[PDB]
Amino acid sequence: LRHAIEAVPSLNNPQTFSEQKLDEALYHGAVLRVRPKAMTVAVIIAGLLP
Amino acid sequence: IAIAVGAMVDAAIVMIENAHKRLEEWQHQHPDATLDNKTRWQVITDASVEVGPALFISLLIITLSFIPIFTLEGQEGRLFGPLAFTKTYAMAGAALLAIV
Amino acid sequence: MIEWIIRRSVANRFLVLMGALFLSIWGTWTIINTPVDALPDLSD
Amino acid sequence: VQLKPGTSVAFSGQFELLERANHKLKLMVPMTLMIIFVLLYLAFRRVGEA
Numbered sequence: 001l002r003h004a005i006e007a008v009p010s011l012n013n014p015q016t017f018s019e020q021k022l023d024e025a026l027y028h029g030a031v032l033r034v035r036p037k038a039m040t041v042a043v044i045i046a047g048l049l050p
Numbered sequence: 051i052a053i054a055v056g057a058m059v060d061a062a063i064v065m066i067e068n069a070h071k072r073l074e075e076w077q078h079q080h081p082d083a084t085l086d087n088k089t090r091w092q093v094i095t096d097a098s099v100e101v102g103p104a105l106f107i108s109l110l111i112i113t114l115s116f117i118p119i120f121t122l123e124g125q126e127g128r129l130f131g132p133l134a135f136t137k138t139y140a141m142a143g144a145a146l147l148a149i150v
Numbered sequence: 151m152i153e154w155i156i157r158r159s160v161a162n163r164f165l166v167l168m169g170a171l172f173l174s175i176w177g178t179w180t181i182i183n184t185p186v187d188a189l190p191d192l193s194d
Numbered sequence: 195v196q197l198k199p200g201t202s203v204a205f206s207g208q209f210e211l212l213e214r215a216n217h218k219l220k221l222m223v224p225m226t227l228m229i230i231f232v233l234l235y236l237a238f239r240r241v242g243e244a
Contacts, residue, residue, distance in 0.1 A: 003100070036067035043059045048052070091160070098156045106152065128191035146159045150166050164239070168232055 004029040054137035057112055061105040061141065065149045069097035097149060106145050113138035 005013070009025045012018070073093055116134030120127055159166060197203065234244035 032071065035071055036064050039063050039067070040060045043063065044056055047059065048056050094160045095157070098153065098160065102152050102156045125191050125193055146156055147166060147170055149156070150159060150163065164235060165232070168228070172228065 001026070001029055051133065051136075053133055054140070057109070058137055058140065058144075061109055061145065062148060064105055065097050065101045065145070068101050069093055072096045094149070101149065102146075106142065109137070109141040109145070112141070 004025045005022065007025060007028070009016075009021045012021055073089075073096075076089070076093075076096075113134065116138070120131045120134050123129075123131055231244050235241065238244060
């Protein structure tokens, strides 16, 4: 999330201050963290269940 | 031994997906016509860039947090204690070895 | 610093594989030799 | 030969620490070869050279 705000939005933040900027940026990290963390809850709930 | 394995698997898929999604984002840029045989050496560093600080240190918490239970002990430390010191030093080298 | 240890480890891909075998074999040796018991760790 | 009730038999000789050391060296010579290669591959890295 530090690099999501450090992305293109960063160079824009001190000027744009846009809601549509952190939206697509936090949406950017979203798809990223779920990709792995979705398979973590799996190996745990289906691992510590037995 | 059934707990650590559950706290090891988490990061054990982190330095995997961060790399699998770091490659699909490279294979998505360059022209697929002619390829090279160096990619499997830069995908290393790519995953290393922002997973080393994250995971290594993050699971470097599971130790100092698993220590409190280790500090109190007359029987409980041989109980839930050995289960603490294990996954830690493991992660330390087994994360760079996992990322390898 | 944390990065460098990951960098030189990127290299020496052969040694790390061996250092993993010396560790896997050293672990397979102790996982057996070490005292196994259903004995709930003593008391007093 | 039937062992009269109330006795037993035990076997021990010069092979007490013989079968031990012997068999145990077969658990060291690989370790030493695996450390031999680690030192040769350390200064040459050419597998066929070691």
